[PDB]
């Protein structure tokens, strides 16, 4: 299921970027890599994390949503921040954020 | 009338992928025309008139351009790619790599 990840890192409209993926799994795993690249880029230390932190990470993004291709309808399903948080949660068990986003999104 | 996401990648670089969203397909198509018009205005010395064929070649310089258009009947988004967008721009009209990114960002991001 082809998936487009729409991210806006700051309140500026020109911080809107996107990446696309072969499946939601990879798109959500991309967000997880962004998060743990961000938390690692924040401590001079090997850091562990709470659940509240992955949620706060996603809430620091001014905008984040996914377009997920549904092969039964040939159309994209739109999922917003609430859904993505839940998904990122169940998988995981300030211009410094833009660098974390661009690291995984565009490389 | 129906919400539209405009996806653009101005150049081969992945970091050049950007987007805007619009309340209307017409707004999204209009936005692409204003990107071209901005691009046209930077030419050294050109005629004051343009053909749709020049709007085509502008869309052909983008590495990627597509639209996701909200289907009010299904609540999902129909994807539409460059050739469809060209035909819609054409229908509307009858009614450098750094310079191309600049023109896109100027219109797409206000």
């Amino acid at each position: 299921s082809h998936t487009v990840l729409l991210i806006q890192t700051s309140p500026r409209l020109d911080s809107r970027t996107w990446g696309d993926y072969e499946s939601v799994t990879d798109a959500l795993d991309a967000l997880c890599k962004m998060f743990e690249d961000f938390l690692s880029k924040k401590s001079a230390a090997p850091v562990t994390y709470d659940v509240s932190q992955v949620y706060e990470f996603l809430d620091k993004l001014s905008d984040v949503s996914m377009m997920i291709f549904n092969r039964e309808t040939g159309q994209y399903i739109g999922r917003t921040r609430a859904w993505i948080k839940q998904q990122v949660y169940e998988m995981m068990r300030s211009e410094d954020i833009k660098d974390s986003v661009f690291k995984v999104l565009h490389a």
Side-chain angles (χ1 to χ4, degrees), chain A residues 2-21 23-32 34-38 40 44-46 48-55 57-59 61-70 73-89 91-94 97 99-102 104-107:
Chain A
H2 181 241
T3 296
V4 176
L5 179 57
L6 306 172
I7 298 186
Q8 179 185 331
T9 64
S10 82
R12 323 234 311 138
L13 298 166
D14 63 47
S15 83
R16 292 181 292 185
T17 189
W18 60 272
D20 60 349
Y21 296 86
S23 53
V24 287
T25 306
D26 305 354
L28 293 158
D29 200 282
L31 282 175
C32 299
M34 298 184 4
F35 157 77
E36 55 205 17
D37 182 76
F38 166 81
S40 148
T48 68
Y49 41 90
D50 256 318
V51 192
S52 324
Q53 273 144 354
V54 58
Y55 275 86
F57 173 76
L58 293 160
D59 286 319
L61 303 171
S62 322
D63 198 288
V64 53
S65 71
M66 285 175 182
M67 300 276 191
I68 305 157
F69 190 77
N70 177 12
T73 71
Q75 303 178 20
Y76 284 86
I77 299 186
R79 303 291 195 202
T80 46
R81 192 196 309 268
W83 185 92
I84 290 177
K85 284 159 147 180
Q86 311 196 37
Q87 298 307 301
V88 169
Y89 165 67
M91 160 173 290
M92 293 262 79
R93 283 156 138 199
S94 321
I97 60 199
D99 318 72
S100 323
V101 170
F102 272 57
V104 183
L105 251 203
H106 311 318

